[PDB]
Structures are given as structure tokens and as C-alpha cells.
Amino acid sequence: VNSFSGYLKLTDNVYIKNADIVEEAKKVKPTVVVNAANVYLKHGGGVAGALNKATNNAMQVESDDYIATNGPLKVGGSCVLSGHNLAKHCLHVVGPNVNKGEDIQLLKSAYENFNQHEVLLAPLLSAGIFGADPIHSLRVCVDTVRTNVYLAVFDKNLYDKLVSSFL
Numbered sequence: 001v002n003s004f005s006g007y008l009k010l011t012d013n014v015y016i017k018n019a020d021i022v023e024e025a026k027k028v029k030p031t032v033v034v035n036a037a038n039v040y041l042k043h044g045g046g047v048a049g050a051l052n053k054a055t056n057n058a059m060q061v062e063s064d065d066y067i068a069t070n071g072p073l074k075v076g077g078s079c080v081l082s083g084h085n086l087a088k089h090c091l092h093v094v095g096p097n098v099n100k101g102e103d104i105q106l107l108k109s110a111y112e113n114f115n116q117h118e119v120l121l122a123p124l125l126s127a128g129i130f131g132a133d134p135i136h137s138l139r140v141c142v143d144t145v146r147t148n149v150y151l152a153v154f155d156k157n158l159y160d161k162l163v164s165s166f167l
């Protein structure tokens with residue numbers, strides 16, 4: 001039993017809710033919140049820009065030190081950093097950004113990072129400004145993630161299409 005509330009159950013382990021991931025993380029304070037990161041951990045917009053704003057830019061400061069030490073992530077890769085005031089940890093996951101020409105096949109590799117954590121609050125990878133079809137992203141999530149994932153979908157219109165079209 002966990003404190004996630006108001007989710008629709010899609011499968012044994014995947015759940016979905018129309019919610020602002022920023023407001024969700026603040027309420028739940030989950031062990032792990034997933035960020036829709038880029039390889040440079042430049043949290044300028046989309047989910048990443050919103051999560052970083054909620055940390056008063058502390059996420060960006062920590063991320064800049066991480067990159068200065070370690071260099072960029074791989075597309076499909078991840079790193080674990082602090083969750084600041086939002087969660088215990090933030091799993092920064094890089095899904096392919098279609099608006100950069102990155103291979104959508106790397107979306108499965110991106111979701112595999114979730115399997116290293118028993119429970120996560122997360123967005124759909126490569127959705128929003130990363131340009132992929134959120135329906136496809138949900139399919140890859142369900143077919144790849146085996147741990148317990150709570151998906152927050154900001155857009156109410158998009159949520160209904162994902163539920164109604166889910167196989």
C-alpha cells in the first residue's frame with residue numbers, strides 16, 4: 001500500500017492520472033520522481049523546466065555540477081540525483097527528442113531505467129516537447145517497465161485519449 005491517489009490501473013504495475021507532476025510530487029513526496037531530462041541536464045522547459053522551477057533552481061545547480069564532473073548522459077540513459085523538496089530522489093531519464101532527430105527505438109532503453117526502482121512517479125517519456133506520440137510512449141512503458149509506475153499526465157484532453165485508446 002502506498003499514498004498515490006486517484007489513479008486508473010492499466011496493468012498489474014502501471015497506473016495513470018490526470019495531474020501536474022509538480023503538484024503530485026509535492027503532495028506524495030515519492031521516493032523517486034522521474035524527470036524528462038536531456039543529455040546536458042539543462043532543465044529549460046517541459047516537465048524538466050517545471051520541476052526545476054519548483055526546486056527554486058536547486059535542481060539546475062546540482063545538475064551543472066554533475067555534468068561538470070561526469071559529462072553528458074546518453075540518450076536512453078539516466079542518473080540519480082537529489083529530489084530536493086519534491087521527492088527523495090530524482091531519476092533524470094533521457095528519452096529521445098524527435099524534434100532533434102533522435103531514434104525513437106531508444107525509448108525502450110529509456111524506460112528500462114525505471115526497472116531499477118521499485119516505485120516511481122513519472123511522466124510519459126519523449127512526450128510533450130520531445131515530440132513523440134504519447135500513445136506509443138504509454139505502450140512502450142507498459143511493455144517495458146515491470147516495477148510500479150504512477151504516470152502523471154498534465155493535459156486533461158490527452159489523458160482521456162490515452163485511457164480510451166488503451167489496449
Ligand SMILES: OC[C@@H](Nc1ncnc2[nH]ccc12)[C@H](O)c1ccc(Cl)cc1
Pocket residue numbers: 019020021022046047050123124125126127128129130134152153154155158
Ligand atoms: O509527456 C509529459 C507532458 N508534460 C508534463 N506531464 C506531467 N506533468 C507536467 N508538469 C509540467 C509539464 C508536464 C508532455 O510534455 C506534454 C505536454 C503537453 C501536451 Cl498537450 C502533451 C504532452
